Amino acid sequence: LSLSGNVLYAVNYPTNTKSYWMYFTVSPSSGVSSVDLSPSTTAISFTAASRGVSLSNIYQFSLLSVLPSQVNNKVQVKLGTSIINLTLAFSSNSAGQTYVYYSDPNYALLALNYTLGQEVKGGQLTSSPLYIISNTSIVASKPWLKNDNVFTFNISVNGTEVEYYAYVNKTFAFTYPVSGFPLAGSDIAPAGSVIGVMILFGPGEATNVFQYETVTIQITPNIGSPLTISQYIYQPDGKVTVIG
Amino acid sequence: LSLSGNVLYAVNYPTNTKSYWMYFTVSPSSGVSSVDLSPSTTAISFTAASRGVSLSNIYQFSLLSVLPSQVNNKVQVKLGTSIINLTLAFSSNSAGQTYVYYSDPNYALLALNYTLGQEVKGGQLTSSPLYIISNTSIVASKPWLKNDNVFTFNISVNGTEVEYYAYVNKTFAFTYPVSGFPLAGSDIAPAGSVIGVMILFGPGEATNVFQYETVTIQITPNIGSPLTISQYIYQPDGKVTVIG
Amino acid sequence: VMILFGPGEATNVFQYETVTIQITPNIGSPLTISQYIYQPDGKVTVIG
Amino acid sequence: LSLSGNVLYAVNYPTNTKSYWMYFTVSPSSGVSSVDLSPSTTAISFTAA
Amino acid sequence: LAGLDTAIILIAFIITAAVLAYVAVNMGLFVTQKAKTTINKGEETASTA
Amino acid sequence: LAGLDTAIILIAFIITAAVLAYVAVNMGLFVTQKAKTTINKGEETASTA
Numbered sequence: 001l002s003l004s005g006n007v008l009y010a011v012n013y014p015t016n017t018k019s020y021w022m023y024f025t026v027s028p029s030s031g032v033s034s035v036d037l038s039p040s041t042t043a044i045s046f047t048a049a050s051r052g053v054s055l056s057n058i059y060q061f062s063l064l065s066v067l068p069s070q071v072n073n074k075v076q077v078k079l080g081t082s083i084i085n086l087t088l089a090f091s092s093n094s095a096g097q098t099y100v101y102y103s104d105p106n107y108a109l110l111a112l113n114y115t116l117g118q119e120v121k122g123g124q125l126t127s128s129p130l131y132i133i134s135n136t137s138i139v140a141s142k143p144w145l146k147n148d149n150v151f152t153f154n155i156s157v158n159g160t161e162v163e164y165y166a167y168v169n170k171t172f173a174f175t176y177p178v179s180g181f182p183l184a185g186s187d188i189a190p191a192g193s194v195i196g197v198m199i200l201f202g203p204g205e206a207t208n209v210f211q212y213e214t215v216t217i218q219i220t221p222n223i224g225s226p227l228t229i230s231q232y233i234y235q236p237d238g239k240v241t242v243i244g
Numbered sequence: 245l246s247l248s249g250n251v252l253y254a255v256n257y258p259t260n261t262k263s264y265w266m267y268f269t270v271s272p273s274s275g276v277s278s279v280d281l282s283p284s285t286t287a288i289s290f291t292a293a294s295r296g297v298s299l300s301n302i303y304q305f306s307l308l309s310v311l312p313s314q315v316n317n318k319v320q321v322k323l324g325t326s327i328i329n330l331t332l333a334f335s336s337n338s339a340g341q342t343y344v345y346y347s348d349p350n351y352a353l354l355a356l357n358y359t360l361g362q363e364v365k366g367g368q369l370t371s372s373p374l375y376i377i378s379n380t381s382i383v384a385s386k387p388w389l390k391n392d393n394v395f396t397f398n399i400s401v402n403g404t405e406v407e408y409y410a411y412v413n414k415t416f417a418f419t420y421p422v423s424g425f426p427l428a429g430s431d432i433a434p435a436g437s438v439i440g441v442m443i444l445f446g447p448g449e450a451t452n453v454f455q456y457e458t459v460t461i462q463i464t465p466n467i468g469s470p471l472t473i474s475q476y477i478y479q480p481d482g483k484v485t486v487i488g
Numbered sequence: 489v490m491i492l493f494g495p496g497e498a499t500n501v502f503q504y505e506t507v508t509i510q511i512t513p514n515i516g517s518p519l520t521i522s523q524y525i526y527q528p529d530g531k532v533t534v535i536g
Numbered sequence: 537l538s539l540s541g542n543v544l545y546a547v548n549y550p551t552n553t554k555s556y557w558m559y560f561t562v563s564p565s566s567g568v569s570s571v572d573l574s575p576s577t578t579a580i581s582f583t584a585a
Numbered sequence: 586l587a588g589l590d591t592a593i594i595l596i597a598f599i600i601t602a603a604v605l606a607y608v609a610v611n612m613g614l615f616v617t618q619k620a621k622t623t624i625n626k627g628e629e630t631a632s633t634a
Numbered sequence: 635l636a637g638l639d640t641a642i643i644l645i646a647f648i649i650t651a652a653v654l655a656y657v658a659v660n661m662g663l664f665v666t667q668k669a670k671t672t673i674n675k676g677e678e679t680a681s682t683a
């Protein structure tokens with residue numbers, strides 16, 4: 001795997017007391033062969049040596065497994081009386097193959113939230129580490145949400161800004177398709193695909209922002225060489241900051 | 245890919261409350277080899293770090309796929325009783341090859357509008373994110389057009405100014421040929437071609453103008469190194485402003 | 489060596505796929521040919 | 537046998553909806569000995585997994 | 586024997602060089618555009634008064 | 635006789651080459667990213683004043 005975009009970092013700017021997520025993009029190196037990215041086989045490690053944080057494997061979920069029909073028209077927004085179904089997985093056709101991708105991390109998060117909620121409902125998963133809501137009133141009735149890490153994001157629906165609050169239990173990573181991915185259902189990144197990797201921080205690692213510190217991420221698939229990513233992080237300069 | 249023109253930015257000047265589009269031009273670097281620009285394989289990302297906007301892939305459509313016969317004489321203007329067919333894709337012959345291009349972004353937009361309308365009619369696409377009309381009276385009957393992003397442009401037909409209103413659903417990018425492109429139908433930019441890239445902003449990203457901010461665009465084809473474009477944007481100074 | 493495709497295998501183009509050909513004569517080791525095929529770029533395309 | 541040329545592939549370009557032929561060239565390896573290529577005895581297999 | 590282990594190392598070294606090529610070209614495109622922007626801002630700074 | 639001892643050494647030499655391949659690619663990915671970061675910091679250093 002090659003790192004094939006900048007590394008983005010998000011914090012409670014300008015206050016800088018708390019850490020939200022990191023995002024970056026990967027693709028198979030030089031287009032030579034495919035990479036298995038299934039989270040049962042692959043590990044993603046995260047270390048911040050200066051502060052003694054060392055996580056051996058945070059990778060848990062992938063939207064590469066998910067067909068568009070499992071997520072599209074399945075989360076919905078209420079605007080007064082009116083109710084609007086969302087499209088989250090976009091798709092296009094070339095040479096009789098359907099390519100699948102998410103246009104941004106926000107639609108990927110909503111698609112993941114739904115997928116995990118559905119896996120919990122089906123008894124396949126014990127608890128979701130991620131919980132996304134638009135209504136903050138609910139939180140008073142769910143005290144476990146009081147203490148875990150929370151960040152917000154906004155989407156436009158019917159030209160109206162909708163704010164979502166994402167509650168994260170523990171630091172975890174997930175992957176999703178960005179381009180060149182016709183293999184929906186498979187967890188395999190083919191040569192000439194682009195895969196988004198997103199790390200969400202839980203209350204442990206979130207506790208204060210990375211400053212004057214080295215952070216290292218490593219992705220290790222079951223075959224082939226691992227990708228090692230390292231950045232010395234200066235102070236974050238905006239809501240999102242470019243670190244690498 | 246090399247950036248091979250200035251980067252142009254358009255806003256609701258002078259009021260500067262809303263953002264319309266960005267345009268720039270690309271060509272294969274140093275004329276060494278061709279680049280695959282098919283939107284199923286290629287990604288175009290857009291980030292404005294300061295405001296936390298981060299889109300992993302906005303690329304959706306290309307007019308490189310389109311033969312002139314699919315767009316020429318297929319959109320028409322009514323001037324009283326008289327009706328005029330438009331030519332949008334221009335063409336010239338060298339060494340038995342037909343080169344194809346669009347003279348400006350306005351003719352490219354009209355050609356794209358038609359192409360997408362036709363793909364929706366043929367059931368190949370679920371909805372067009374772009375809808376262009378000259379008649380504003382229609383809008384009252386189509387309330388979904390009330391809330392999405394709108395900008396205008398003018399063409400001269402029969403020496404008369406015709407104003408078109410372009411309604412955009414979501415932020416997206418498309419590509420079109422500008423010169424040196426004989427490979428009509430292919431999505432491949434050959435060495436010594438020039439390709440226009442246009443980004444249209446939807447109601448989410450349009451909401452206020454870029455000022456005192458860094459904007460980054462990256463184009464990542466399925467083979468070869470990506471092109472990364474970054475500008476610090478001062479206040480916009482006209483209907484179109486040169487940012488890079 | 490020329491391979492012509494019939495209506496079965498012709499039905500859509502090879503893209504983002506591995507194709508393998510093997511020639512096995514009656515004596516000696518077979519020749520195994522494998523290509524990952526990206527999108528075809530012309531009337532004829534060079535795949536390997 | 538050695539592969540002794542490039543592998544060529546032909547399609548209904550630019551439309552790319554249909555596949556026509558593949559061509560390649562072979563020769564006995566390192567010039568050491570001859571190869572029987574009779575189609576009653578030899579097989580050529582083709583797979584697109 | 587040696588016609589295999591050498592081939593594997595060649596594959597790896599090619600990929601290693603291709604990775605540097607990928608990074609170097611991308612970063613050259615980036616930095617040269619920063620230079621373009623700077624040259625423009627320098628001319629604006631010298632002209633505007 | 636010889637159709638076995640040779641095969642074992644081949645297996646071992648392949649694994650040995652694969653181990654170098656694994657390390658070389660990983661370390662190339664690492665160092666090229668350090669170079670990317672350095673080039674960015676160099677441009678920041680030249681621009682900021």
Ligand SMILES: *[C@@H]1O[C@H](CO)[C@@H](O[C@@H]2O[C@H](CO[C@H]3O[C@H](CO)[C@@H](O)[C@H](O)[C@@H]3O)[C@@H](O[C@H]3O[C@H](CO)[C@@H](O)[C@H](O)[C@@H]3O)[C@H](O[C@@H]3O[C@H](CS(=O)(=O)O)[C@@H](O[C@@H]4O[C@H](CO)[C@@H](O)[C@H](O)[C@H]4O)[C@H](O)[C@H]3O)[C@H]2NC(C)=O)[C@H](O)[C@H]1NC(C)=O
Nearest residue numbers: 079080081082083084157158159160384386387388390391
């Ligand atoms: C997105 O959000 C938009 C608002 O931001 C929505 O547009 C508004 O929808 C109202 C309900 O109608 C829609 O319902 C579904 C949506 O799921 C659509 O598929 C339908 O096509 C339908 O259009 C609509 O209200 C009207 O319908 C009522 C009966 O259902 C009727 O009582 C109202 O009078 C309206 O005709 C909106 O249309 C405009 O509404 C305003 C009033 S208000 O803003 O709705 O309160 C009317 O203005 C005037 O109000 C004055 C009072 O100051 C009165 O004196 C006057 O008599 C009255 O005319 C407009 O005339 C009327 O056009 C509509 N808003 C607009 C701008 O068109 C949209 O549906 C949402 N889309 C989705 C998919 O959810």
Ligand SMILES: *[C@@H]1O[C@H](CO)[C@@H](O[C@@H]2O[C@H](CO[C@H]3O[C@H](CO)[C@@H](O)[C@H](O)[C@@H]3O)[C@@H](O[C@H]3O[C@H](CO)[C@@H](O)[C@H](O)[C@@H]3O)[C@H](O[C@@H]3O[C@H](CS(=O)(=O)O)[C@@H](O[C@@H]4O[C@H](CO)[C@@H](O)[C@H](O)[C@H]4O)[C@H](O)[C@H]3O)[C@H]2NC(C)=O)[C@H](O)[C@H]1NC(C)=O
Nearest residue numbers: 074075076077110113114116117118121128131132133134
């Ligand atoms: C992220 O994923 C979360 C799950 O991990 C989602 O939370 C779940 O939301 C359900 C409703 O989702 C819809 O409405 C919201 C706004 O309310 C929209 O934002 C969404 O887009 C979507 O359209 C919610 O279902 C209940 O509330 C609904 C209110 O609209 C109502 O229509 C339903 O009928 C439900 O009552 C989930 O709440 C839980 O639901 C389960 C049943 S089910 O899984 O929904 O089928 C209940 O279990 C029941 O418990 C009772 C005991 O009280 C038993 O007797 C019964 O047998 C059993 O079925 C739970 O009690 C109830 O809490 C809600 N789930 C959680 C874990 O909170 C979230 O919406 C997703 N985010 C987004 C943006 O979509």
Ligand SMILES: *[C@@H]1O[C@H](CO)[C@@H](O[C@@H]2O[C@H](CO[C@H]3O[C@H](CO)[C@@H](O)[C@H](O)[C@@H]3O)[C@@H](O[C@H]3O[C@H](CO)[C@@H](O)[C@H](O)[C@@H]3O)[C@H](O[C@@H]3O[C@H](CS(=O)(=O)O)[C@@H](O[C@@H]4O[C@H](CO)[C@@H](O)[C@H](O)[C@H]4O)[C@H](O)[C@H]3O)[C@H]2NC(C)=O)[C@H](O)[C@H]1NC(C)=O
Nearest residue numbers: 120126127128129130131132142144145148167168169170
């Ligand atoms: C992170 O990890 C936390 C701890 O591991 C999780 O907290 C637990 O959440 C349960 C479900 O709530 C949430 O589910 C999804 C995850 O799948 C979340 O994303 C949503 O935010 C959603 O709210 C919660 O269960 C309760 O809510 C359920 C509906 O959501 C409902 O079906 C249950 O019956 C519960 O009411 C946990 O709360 C615990 O509930 C158990 C009962 S049960 O086994 O859950 O059914 C209680 O056990 C009882 O204890 C009492 C005495 O206290 C005894 O009398 C009784 O015999 C016994 O059953 C626990 O006391 C009670 O805490 C909640 N647990 C904790 C420890 O926090 C969290 O969901 C994870 N994810 C996120 C995003 O935060």
Ligand SMILES: *[C@@H]1O[C@H](CO)[C@@H](O[C@@H]2O[C@H](CO[C@H]3O[C@H](CO)[C@@H](O)[C@H](O)[C@@H]3O)[C@@H](O[C@H]3O[C@H](CO)[C@@H](O)[C@H](O)[C@@H]3O)[C@H](O[C@@H]3O[C@H](CS(=O)(=O)O)[C@@H](O[C@@H]4O[C@H](CO)[C@@H](O)[C@H](O)[C@H]4O)[C@H](O)[C@H]3O)[C@H]2NC(C)=O)[C@H](O)[C@H]1NC(C)=O
Nearest residue numbers: 077078079080081082133134135136137138139140141142
């Ligand atoms: C987000 O979530 C909020 C609460 O979780 C929702 O607000 C609740 O909805 C009702 C009011 O309508 C609201 O709707 C619009 C659009 O959403 C809001 O913008 C408005 O500001 C407005 O608040 C209200 O329900 C009451 O009226 C119902 C009949 O219309 C009736 O069935 C209910 O029982 C309520 O009386 C809610 O008020 C509270 O409602 C809860 C129940 S529920 O959350 O509505 O399901 C009641 O709990 C009850 O408590 C008794 C004990 O006294 C129990 O015995 C019973 O089992 C239990 O149901 C509260 O007593 C009551 O005060 C209102 N809740 C709040 C906190 O505002 C809101 O609509 C959601 N969406 C948005 C966009 O904000």
Ligand SMILES: *[C@@H]1O[C@H](CO)[C@@H](O[C@@H]2O[C@H](CO[C@H]3O[C@H](CO)[C@@H](O)[C@H](O)[C@@H]3O)[C@@H](O[C@H]3O[C@H](CO)[C@@H](O)[C@H](O)[C@@H]3O)[C@H](O[C@@H]3O[C@H](CS(=O)(=O)O)[C@@H](O[C@@H]4O[C@H](CO)[C@@H](O)[C@H](O)[C@H]4O)[C@H](O)[C@H]3O)[C@H]2NC(C)=O)[C@H](O)[C@H]1NC(C)=O
Nearest residue numbers: 320321322323324325326327328329400401402403404405
């Ligand atoms: C582009 O738009 C132009 C106008 O801005 C158009 O030119 C005008 O076309 C009129 C209709 O004719 C054309 O129709 C098709 C277009 O699809 C062409 O291919 C044809 O070749 C044809 O020329 C034309 O009107 C005339 O034709 C009428 C019958 O069809 C007749 O009733 C009129 O009298 C005209 O002969 C225009 O020609 C001029 O028209 C004016 C009147 S008006 O401006 O049309 O109303 C005449 O002026 C005089 O008017 C006074 C009243 O003040 C009378 O008293 C007097 O008797 C009358 O002569 C001119 O004499 C006459 O030349 C024509 N305009 C011009 C300046 O030539 C053009 O067709 C459009 N092109 C396309 C491709 O759409």
Ligand SMILES: *[C@@H]1O[C@H](CO)[C@@H](O[C@@H]2O[C@H](CO[C@H]3O[C@H](CO)[C@@H](O)[C@H](O)[C@@H]3O)[C@@H](O[C@H]3O[C@H](CO)[C@@H](O)[C@H](O)[C@@H]3O)[C@H](O[C@@H]3O[C@H](CS(=O)(=O)O)[C@@H](O[C@@H]4O[C@H](CO)[C@@H](O)[C@H](O)[C@H]4O)[C@H](O)[C@H]3O)[C@H]2NC(C)=O)[C@H](O)[C@H]1NC(C)=O
Nearest residue numbers: 318319320321354357358360361362365372375376377378
């Ligand atoms: C951009 O692309 C848009 C599509 O995404 C185009 O919108 C479509 O415009 C059609 C007419 O275009 C011509 O006229 C306009 C000015 O009106 C010119 O600017 C254009 O250059 C061009 O010359 C329009 O067709 C209808 O209106 C015509 C009025 O002139 C009329 O002649 C036609 O006969 C049509 O009635 C589209 O409106 C939709 O048309 C479809 C059918 S079709 O796709 O046109 O073949 C209708 O579907 C029908 O629905 C009925 C139910 O009511 C069914 O029973 C029937 O089976 C089914 O066919 C729609 O109902 C009707 O709305 C219009 N399309 C949309 C989505 O609005 C736009 O013009 C393009 N922009 C430019 C500048 O060209």
Ligand SMILES: *[C@@H]1O[C@H](CO)[C@@H](O[C@@H]2O[C@H](CO[C@H]3O[C@H](CO)[C@@H](O)[C@H](O)[C@@H]3O)[C@@H](O[C@H]3O[C@H](CO)[C@@H](O)[C@H](O)[C@@H]3O)[C@H](O[C@@H]3O[C@H](CS(=O)(=O)O)[C@@H](O[C@@H]4O[C@H](CO)[C@@H](O)[C@H](O)[C@H]4O)[C@H](O)[C@H]3O)[C@H]2NC(C)=O)[C@H](O)[C@H]1NC(C)=O
Nearest residue numbers: 084364370371372373374375376386388389392411412413
């Ligand atoms: C952006 O994304 C929006 C939402 O995803 C799109 O809005 C939807 O546009 C539909 C088509 O209109 C437009 O089509 C092109 C895109 O291809 C646009 O560029 C043009 O502006 C053009 O106007 C619209 O469908 C309606 O118009 C069609 C003709 O244009 C017509 O064939 C349909 O039958 C509709 O009248 C969507 O409106 C929705 O229509 C469905 C029915 S259908 O599936 O579309 O046929 C309604 O469902 C019905 O709901 C009622 C109750 O409300 C039920 O009783 C009934 O059983 C059920 O069928 C929806 O209610 C209604 O909203 C419209 N949808 C929304 C949510 O906005 C938009 O086109 C995209 N592009 C742009 C440029 O804005």
Ligand SMILES: *[C@@H]1O[C@H](CO)[C@@H](O[C@@H]2O[C@H](CO[C@H]3O[C@H](CO)[C@@H](O)[C@H](O)[C@@H]3O)[C@@H](O[C@H]3O[C@H](CO)[C@@H](O)[C@H](O)[C@@H]3O)[C@H](O[C@@H]3O[C@H](CS(=O)(=O)O)[C@@H](O[C@@H]4O[C@H](CO)[C@@H](O)[C@H](O)[C@H]4O)[C@H](O)[C@H]3O)[C@H]2NC(C)=O)[C@H](O)[C@H]1NC(C)=O
Nearest residue numbers: 321322323324325326377378379380381382383384385386
């Ligand atoms: C842009 O779009 C406008 C509306 O979408 C168009 O205006 C409509 O055209 C007719 C008038 O002629 C216009 O033509 C020139 C050049 O375009 C304009 O510059 C003029 O200013 C002028 O306005 C008019 O049609 C009426 O007359 C017809 C016979 O000549 C008749 O068939 C129609 O039914 C109309 O009575 C329009 O007036 C409205 O028309 C709509 C239908 S349509 O939009 O014309 O197709 C009617 O809706 C009807 O409503 C009834 C309920 O009462 C329903 O039962 C029926 O099914 C439905 O058809 C309205 O009632 C009626 O008022 C006129 N519309 C408007 C709003 O002005 C215009 O020409 C287009 N082009 C330009 C360049 O502006």
Ligand SMILES: *[C@@H]1O[C@H](CO)[C@@H](O[C@@H]2O[C@H](CO)[C@@H](O)[C@H](O)[C@H]2NC(C)=O)[C@H](O)[C@H]1NC(C)=O
Nearest residue numbers: 378396397398399400401404405406407408483
């Ligand atoms: C684009 O076209 C519109 C109309 O075709 C122009 O608006 C006209 O502006 C003039 C004065 O500049 C007025 O006399 C007309 O009445 C207007 N037309 C209408 C229909 O209202 C607009 O100025 C044009 N803009 C550009 C930049 O070309």
